[PDB]
Amino acid sequence: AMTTSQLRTWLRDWVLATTGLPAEEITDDKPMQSFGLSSRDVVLLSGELENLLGVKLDATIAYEYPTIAALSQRLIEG
Numbered sequence: 001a002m003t004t005s006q007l008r009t010w011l012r013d014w015v016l017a018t019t020g021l022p023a024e025e026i027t028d029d030k031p032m033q034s035f036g037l038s039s040r041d042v043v044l045l046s047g048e049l050e051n052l053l054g055v056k057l058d059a060t061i062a063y064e065y066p067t068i069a070a071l072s073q074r075l076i077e078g
């Protein structure tokens with residue numbers, strides 16, 4: 001079982017890989033809307049997290065909890 005800390009790093013790493021942004025633009029508290037993710041990729045992230053965590057999630061979960069910090073808190077604490 002991942003911690004919130006480990007999940008925040010998984011998500012920051014995913015944002016970086018998915019957008020090409022510099023590391024300094026991706027932080028735990030910035031609004032996810034500022035990352036320039038396509039909404040296809042935002043929905044794809046939910047599916048990847050489903051597999052990562054073994055649970056069912058809303059397709060739009062990352063907009064619903066719109067920071068890396070808030071999303072990790074919600075996924076680990078339900």
Ligand SMILES: CC(C)(COP(=O)(O)O)[C@@H](O)C(=O)NCCC(=O)NCCS
Pocket residue numbers: 038039040043
């Ligand atoms: C999340 C989303 C709705 C895409 O939303 P988005 O384009 O805002 O980024 C995607 O998962 C989906 O369900 N459909 C995208 C394309 C589609 O359904 N029809 C194409 C009409 S132009």
